[PDB]
């Protein structure tokens, strides 16, 4: 996700809390280890790789210390947990279309029935200046206007986009069906074949044709649902400059303090 | 419900979001001041 | 997947570290003592460097509780898929053998007898006379679930008490006087509801 | 007591100002910075 | 070691009192057994 979100003062409060830790135990050494001892008890407990043992009061103090590591373990791994299990346009409900704004800019195609349904309803009044100022020539444009981030929502047919959000990562279709109508066929009233043509609509439903059509063109496609990291990756880029710069102070220091022990 | 709401309506527990809850501050002050209890106890007997 | 060919990665990199780390305080065994210590740190100058490493490995077990629950939190399942299922189209074929009715001459009955009248022969062992019926069948397990008018369903589905009983799906529908004038002004009208949404205010 | 305290940093909102029981409003140069409130001229609470 | 160890072992590993030390391929299905320690501590809690 991210590099650190701890507030790098309290980081560095911890390293200060480490060098008090190490005060702490090489000056309570003298009461009855002076050199390199105490370090590394301060990175053996501080660390939890050792919990255990290795001058009373000194140690009651030390265990306190361990008292406050588990607690801060405790707390980081609940801040661990939090900030990543813890915490849009919904439909004409909304403030956002109620009271329609200019950085919320929503529109249509020009002689469609979806703005026959807009201008036929009366508290679509303040849309009208967003839905009939901005449409376009071709749905694909709409498309294209989520994909350049032209306009933050479109209200189109149920199917398409629902088709459409099933193929690319850039639609959901939210809200309920607005105006609930029916897929009709475009017929005369002096067409007499209304009535066979009706007959097999209700075949196609009865005998499942329509359902037919939902296997055959419907029913292919999905998406992901989002089921190693960046702060992996992270992990892997500050432990590897860490090491390689460990290492190399490790030839260093070793050689200065054998060429010391030479002597 | 035509003119009132805005997001102040939609208040969702305005927490924390990293804290500095006082604590160990306290806790610290006991500690060094249990070395002020045992380090004047000099077994000069 | 990944992570794990990065974990061992890295515990290759810290194991050969280890080795010239013990070839440097030569002046007990990386083959013995450094590879079970790895193990037990991710569950003496570079041993507090370790260490480190195994904060650092703290810290992803921290990460992955924190991953697994968003896993098992973030199941929600179901069993019946529908007609395409062998429950109902052979239900003594997978035992015990399944209980589905219906409210007699009905029009999912015609539309089934349309499709199965075997279906039929199974579903006339179990046929009610009521939906109160339904809801004790459900309620006492006597039938398994229901094909009607799912509007129906979708009425009192909500209306039961725990609702555990689930229906078909999530909302998947299967089964998909002449010369009147009065027929243009209802259709009109139709037009003008739906167009208002007042059915929606029934709703 | 992981979950505990899961518990208790989750389930702060706090405020700041009670109201004109402050000295916030009536002693705002005994506070610094001093405060800042204003009101549109030839109101109601004015006159309160 | 056949009497009281490994008792005291799996008792050390399976408890967490002792992760570390104390042929091979029996101590690589150990710490695979820790692993499962592990993970099963991170699910209960």
Not at chain 1, 40 to 51: A, D, M, P, Q, Y
Not at chain 1, 155 to 165: M, T
Not at chain 1, 234 to 260: C, D, P, S, W
Request: hydrophobic share 50%; with cysteine; aromatic share 14%.
């Amino acid at each position: 996700s991210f590099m650190q979100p701890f507030q790098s003062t309290l980081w560095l409060l911890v390293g200060l809390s480490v060098h008090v830790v190490a005060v702490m135990l090489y000056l309570l050494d003298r009461f009855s280890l002076t050199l390199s001892s105490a370090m590394w008890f301060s990175w053996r407990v501080l660390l939890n790789s050792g919990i255990g043992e290795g001058s009373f009061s000194a140690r009651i103090l030390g265990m306190v210390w361990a008292g406050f590591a588990m607690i801060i373990v405790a707390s980081y791994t609940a801040n661990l947990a939090a900030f990543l299990v813890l915490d849009r346009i919904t439909g004409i409900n909304d403030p956002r279309l109620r009271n329609p704004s200019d950085k919320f800019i929503y529109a249509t195609v020009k002689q469609s029935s979806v703005d026959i349904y807009f201008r036929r309803q009366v508290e679509l009044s303040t849309m009208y200046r967003h839905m009939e100022k901005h449409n376009y020539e071709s749905a694909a444009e709409a498309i294209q206007a989520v994909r350049d981030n032209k306009l933050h929502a479109f209200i189109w047919d149920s199917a398409v986009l629902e088709f459409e959000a099933s193929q690319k990562c850039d639609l959901v279709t939210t809200g309920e069906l607005f105006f609930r109508s029916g897929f009709g066929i475009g017929m005369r009233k002096d067409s007499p074949w209304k009535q066979n043509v009706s007959l097999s609509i209700l075949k196609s439903h009865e005998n499942g044709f329509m359902e037919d059509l939902d296997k055959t063109w419907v029913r292919y496609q999905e998406c992901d649902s989002r089921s190693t990291f960046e702060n992996m990756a992270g992990v892997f880029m500050l432990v590897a400059g860490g090491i390689v710069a460990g290492i190399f102070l490790i030839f260093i220091e070793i050689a200065y303090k054998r060429h010391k022990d030479a002597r | 419900t035509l003119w009132l709401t805005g997001i102040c309506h939609n208040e969702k527990n305005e927490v924390m979001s990293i804290d500095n809850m006082a604590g160990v501050f306290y806790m610290l002050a006991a500690a060094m001041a249990l070395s002020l209890i045992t380090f004047i106890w000099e077994h000069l007997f | 997947a990944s992570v794990w060919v990065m974990m061992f990665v890295m515990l290759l990199i810290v194991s050969a570290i280890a080795v010239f780390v013990f070839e440097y305080f030569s002046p007990s065994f990386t083959i013995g003592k450094a590879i079970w210590l790895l193990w037990g740190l991710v569950f003496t100058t570079s041993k507090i460097m370790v260490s480190v490493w195994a904060f650092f490995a703290v810290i992803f077990l921290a990460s992955y509780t924190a991953n697994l629950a968003a896993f098992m939190i973030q199941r929600f399942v179901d069993q019946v898929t529908g007609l395409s299922d062998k429950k109902f189209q052979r239900p003594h074929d997978y035992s015990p053998p399944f209980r589905f009715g219906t409210v007699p001459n009905g029009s999912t009955e015609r539309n089934i007898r349309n499709n199965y009248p075997y279906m039929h022969q199974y579903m006339t062992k179990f046929n009610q006379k009521g939906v109160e019926d339904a809801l004790v069948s459900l309620k006492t397990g006597k039938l398994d679930a229901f094909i009607y008018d799912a509007a129906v369903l979708n009425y009192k589905a909500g209306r039961d008490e725990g609702c555990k009983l689930v229906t078909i799906g999530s909302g998947y529908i299967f089964a998909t006087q002449k010369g009147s004038p009065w027929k243009r002004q209802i259709d009109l009208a139709l037009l003008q509801f739906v167009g208002d949404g007042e059915m929606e205010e029934l709703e």
